[model samples]
Target: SMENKKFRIALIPGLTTDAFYITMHKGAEAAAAAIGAQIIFQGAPDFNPVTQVPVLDAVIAKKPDAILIAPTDTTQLVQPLKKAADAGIPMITVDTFIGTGDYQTGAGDGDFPLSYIASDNVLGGEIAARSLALAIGDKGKVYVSNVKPGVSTTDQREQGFKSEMAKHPGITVLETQFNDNDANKAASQLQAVYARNPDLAGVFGANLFSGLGSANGVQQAGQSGTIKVVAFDAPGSVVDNLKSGLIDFAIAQHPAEIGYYGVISAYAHLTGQSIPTKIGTGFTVINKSNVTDPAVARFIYAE
Candidate 1:
């Protein structure tokens, strides 16, 4: 109880409404309960630094022993995050990293978040390419509908997917479009892509919102089975999309693991223990074939 009393951790998400963040919160809560540390989870309803900055300020004011944050905008979040570091708060980045400087070394004079925890996003992208390639029979124009470009998590996924898509000469990866984490925008952009490339055979949704938008886009274009989709994160809608044949595959990150270890890493730092510069939580590749299996279903987020 004393340990818990002494170490209150602020666990902040990029978007509080997202199932990914909710699952991550669950993991952080579990870790906090197990370790006897107090954890407060909060975030913006949507992924915007404007909202996140205030949340960061509030968390800093609370003077939590340490902070765990998933930055909404890679660069925009720098100053506020720096303010937290200046206050002598130990910090760890979960699911995403700040972009102003080397996350491992901290921004400019050191003392930013000391460590990073997230999925191997590049690998997730590579897997997306493979899955989409299979779904589309390895050939045709494929579009990538992604969240804003600067955020480290989705950016890496897009990069990895592009790199892997290159391996298959038959598939053409069209210019990636930014959706600003808005599903309506993603849907509209995808519909436009369908109009330009009527024979477009596949798509990669680099995050949950974009993926769901892409699924809706496919339906709007009246190309459900004809235009395949490989999406990131198995939100309930994503799982439904997979079962309903809207999404051919879902890349499920271990958000719970990211949260659990994020707290542990911060606790280790606060307790004066050494911590790694980076820790990858990894991901799961899910498809209809295994979507309902107990082992696979366990990885999928429900609420």
Candidate 2:
């Protein structure tokens, strides 16, 4: 009974369109309800610091016992987050880390956040590379769609995928570009890339929105099954596409764990407890065969 009144958790997602955050919210809600705590969710629809700033401030103003955020801008988001920390608010950030010298302590985060939780992005990339090699039998020119301009986590994933491809020299990476988390921008980029490399073997997306956009672009350009698509995250649409063969495979992260542990840490720190130095919520590769698999179903990041 005493545990129920222990905490209030806030889920600040990275971008509104990203289903990963939504899944995290669902998990956080369940955990909070079970513990008799309150939970609030907030975030930006786009990956813009200026837009996210006010929202972060507002979350602070609301004075929740703890805040969980996925930073939109690594450096730019620190100030407001640090402000909340300075105010004696327990703050935890997931997926990405803020600049150094800010925030009291955070979760699934590094630098400013007390702790951070994320998948082994590099390993996830390697998984994608290996999966693609198997999907295409090791011969093709694929496009590596990197999301946003400066998110280190996604960059790590792209780098890992590219590095692994180095082993399979026959599998050439056609091109790489920033999607800015815009479906239109991602679709447009894919259209141009596929146009130039007409016989493109596959396209790989580094995150949810870009991954989905990449799949849609390839499908709309009439290249659907022709150009095997690999994406990150298990958004509802992503899973649907996987089932229909629109997407060949996906690298899924434990989004709910992002919140489940983030809040657990914030509350622990608020109560003067120790938090882990770092942790990985882990990743799983999903395909048509395992799309409906119970284990995959438990950790999916879709609606």
Candidate 3:
């Protein structure tokens, strides 16, 4: 049974243009090579289920041995995913997962993934919150600019950041600004944050686009150092901003590891091996102090 057949795997990410997801793709490629498997990496160009739904349908039509996906929406992708599972496709989610329990209210129910591999995003948020508090001396108005609501990953990060903020009474967190992953929109939202909270001492951007946009907004507002910035997922632009002092701390998730282990987990399940239900790949807290260090540089996304 193991002699002639090659294992086929479909690796789908939320967005192909994002450097974070690109790094994840590279990791999946490396794992596929080592495991003697063929991976067809495909995903939507944007972070929307409208695009992802069709891409997943195409992958399902290929009838691969296993499928690994990073869902863009918490609930919208469920019905399509349920179809794949009903068709006997073994599925694993990476980076982001479908919601359940309290999260499933009003959101349709469907077959859940066998395993999930991602960073502890809530912890990442906590790290960002603490970093912002320290940077601002724990007493000032701060804002959290995030992508759209219902994206499980960013939502949890936002929640975690706010939860930590509750510990510091002096710091005021404004209502979250929804940017919907658009850099221009995020920039506009951050500018609004500045207009509304002139004493805004710090800000947190929950994802790559939001982080980069927030940095640009700070620079535009002429508050580069005046408003300390902390963000998640340091793409090249985010890294440049950090080095330039436009951003202070970056909570970098181990996306490559997420992709690498996601493939491994799916392969294990396909081959009748035991795998954990949840694997938190973890994150790295990076600042100007250790950002260029070899250990930290190794995790930065190059391309």
Candidate 4:
């Protein structure tokens, strides 16, 4: 019943309050139980790299079998994560990755990472762009709100979004920025965007929280549905927006796979087994049709 009977693993999320990571937590817990391992999840209430650094450092000191993390700032958190890597603790980066392929005592080999599991962020972006193109009647200026500067996942999604926008020459991605995915900041940015281009086609928020903020901004700007809205992640707030028709569509990632693999791979590395460097969970698009489906709705909550 127990292949790896006594191993312990840790999960460090980018932000503690976001429900998007809960699926990973749940999946990892179920997987851990099946393998007879232990897991601890650590995170901060806000999206702060400074806060996560100390927590990751503290977890490393504990010398758990492995550590799975979602880095807020890839560059800033690398040093601490590298320390864990050097110490032989299997450091698995989930949902995001450190830059330059550096890990452990040296720069990561060509393979890169002990195990970096994530959904296809770029594809999610493309899906969002396509949805917006349709909703906006094929042409108009739009905004793509990305993560705080240098956060890997945000950058990846932005790349995908911009690449897709390139296909629709008629639509303009007016500008992009790091809202920090903060509601107030998103609202302010939306205000400015709306002020400048009252006929803006849509706003694509690159993450769950950013999407929520965009929804808030749309309602505040009195342009709900008038300007298409697309986003990543299916948080409850996003679901609410979908029901109210504030958000046109959402690109979803399978966080369950992130957590499950994070735990399982860490345990494998600790036990000297082969672990793939990259574990991609892929993605899906959710719209009015499937947003309410029981299968998809399950990922929108903490339960």
Candidate 5:
């Protein structure tokens, strides 16, 4: 089967502004260039299905040969995405997913997307929990600053963190603070949580915004080193915080690799080649001890 030709692959990230998604766009572009294909970087300004659906509708109207998206909602984005599948635009979800992320095999709702590519968020969260617990000497109260509830990746990370924290009988995890991806709100939430739990030992930022915002809040509270903060993603700002002692560690996901392989997978599928239903990217744990190490520079999320 021929006719792969110069295909157009539409990349719809969770949002267009974040450095994480921006790095992903660059990666997708790289793969597109290598494969002699093109990418239309279309996405919502906000990470919500209400905004994402309209952007997706516009992309679907253009009817690219394939689609790559980081679904904002675990369930709300399902039928909206089904439109692309029904229109014959194959999609590969990157970074986040909709419905259980278990595709094909008559899986309930999200069986349509050709692939789901992202880091193992649960494991990342567990690692974060352990790191934070060890840093706090496995005692005192801590909580998660997460972006909205339905986001797949953040939710999994929160769940994994709590489950692991339970193993440390000395540590107590407080209720999660949903920040709606707003750094200002996340910052305020950190203060509010700290007010109630004055003896708070640590905090976990489930994503980039959450982590950076909370780190800022810790600084405002004059408790940077006193309260350990573990962030989920590595960006320049986070690394700066790590160096300055605002944050302790960051679990950096390879979003660039996720985007790179996403385009490659779509291209292969469009070219009548077999492609896997799922792919996973790796992660790097970044801390102040090695934040300046040249070998660790590659993990920083690009702007």
Candidate 6:
């Protein structure tokens, strides 16, 4: 079975320990086991180009049959992945992607990886909103803090957040704060929002910083438990907050699905089969109570 030689694949995620990526490794291992392939799981502890790029270099140097990664930055990962492709390593992107995520065009992803596998773009926001409402007793003012207005995924989350909160009669959705991917800015926005509305019953942090930053603001005001916070992304910090009651709940993306499809897609392409340019996954919710139960703890991110 030379054509079916046990393929060795490398899966480099955004960060190494986060439950989202860790669970994704579970999915990756499942596929690798089924297909009789070997997966090399490796990543930085945090999502930053400085750290991820070096890790990417090492993975490329190993020369696995193929590579699967969730790039840390949009533009930064392009060259590093392009270098991978240039080295003749077939690759796919999972969770977060690089560039436009529209790799179906012109030499399509020539230097970049093929296939962008991600979870539900807006559903996480919707779920977070509903979860926030539940925390605040469904009758209070909450605001949406976003990374920026144009980021595709974050925007979808914002839309989902607003739409779900729209139907809740007791929920008063306040103005959204744009943080421009700045945690400090997001934190400031939260403090200002509280300044304007001392009765800010709850708040939804659309992404990682949005969640942590909002929690920071609550702590700054010395109101961590009172001003409930619901955040997106189940990293270690977010979960810590959940445990400490800083953030009430978290939106867990289906990285498991992303990792599975990412490897499967790369394997298909490597095996002379076709694959989709886009792979869509979904999300789940987690909190203190369920985070302990095996059923829900499964949703907790690894770190």
lDDT of 1: 0.85
Q: Which structure among the candidates has the greatest TM-score?
A: 5
Clashing pairs in 3: none
Error of 5 at 102 (Å): 0.8
Model 1: residues >4 Å from true position, as ranges? Answer: 1-6, 104-111
Give the per-residue lDDT digits (tens) of candidate 4, residues 195-229.
98878879998988778788788899898888788
Query: Is 1 or 4 the stronger prediction by TM-score?
Result: 1
Compared with the true structure, model 6 gives a TM-score of 0.75
Listed in order, each prediction's TM-score against the native is 0.94, 0.91, 0.94, 0.92, 0.97, 0.75
Clashing pairs in 5: none
- Cα lDDT over the full model 4: 0.79
lDDT of 4 at 90: 65
Query: Cα lDDT of all candidates, in order?
Result: 0.85, 0.78, 0.85, 0.79, 0.89, 0.81
Name model 3 segments beyond 4 Å from true: 1-5, 101-108
Candidate 5 residue lDDT tens string, 99-161 = 788876586877888789999999989999999998899898999999987788998899899
Q: Considering lDDT, where higher is better, how would the candidates rank from best to worst?
A: 5, 1, 3, 6, 4, 2
Candidate 3's TM-score: 0.94
Clash total of candidate 4: 0
Which tens-of-lDDT digit does each residue in 52-112 have in candidate 3?
A: 9999999999999999998888788888998998889988888888865122133446435
Cα lDDT of candidate 2 equals 0.78
lDDT string for model 2 (1-303, tens) is 164457767778877767788888776777776666788877887777888888888888888988888877777887778788779876666777676323434442325567766677788888888888888889988878877657867877888999999999788887687888776788888899887877788878888877888888988898877888888888777667877788899888988887777777776777778888566888878888887889876667756
lDDT-best of 1 and 5: 5
Q: Stretches of candidate 4 above 4 Å error? A: 1-3, 101-112
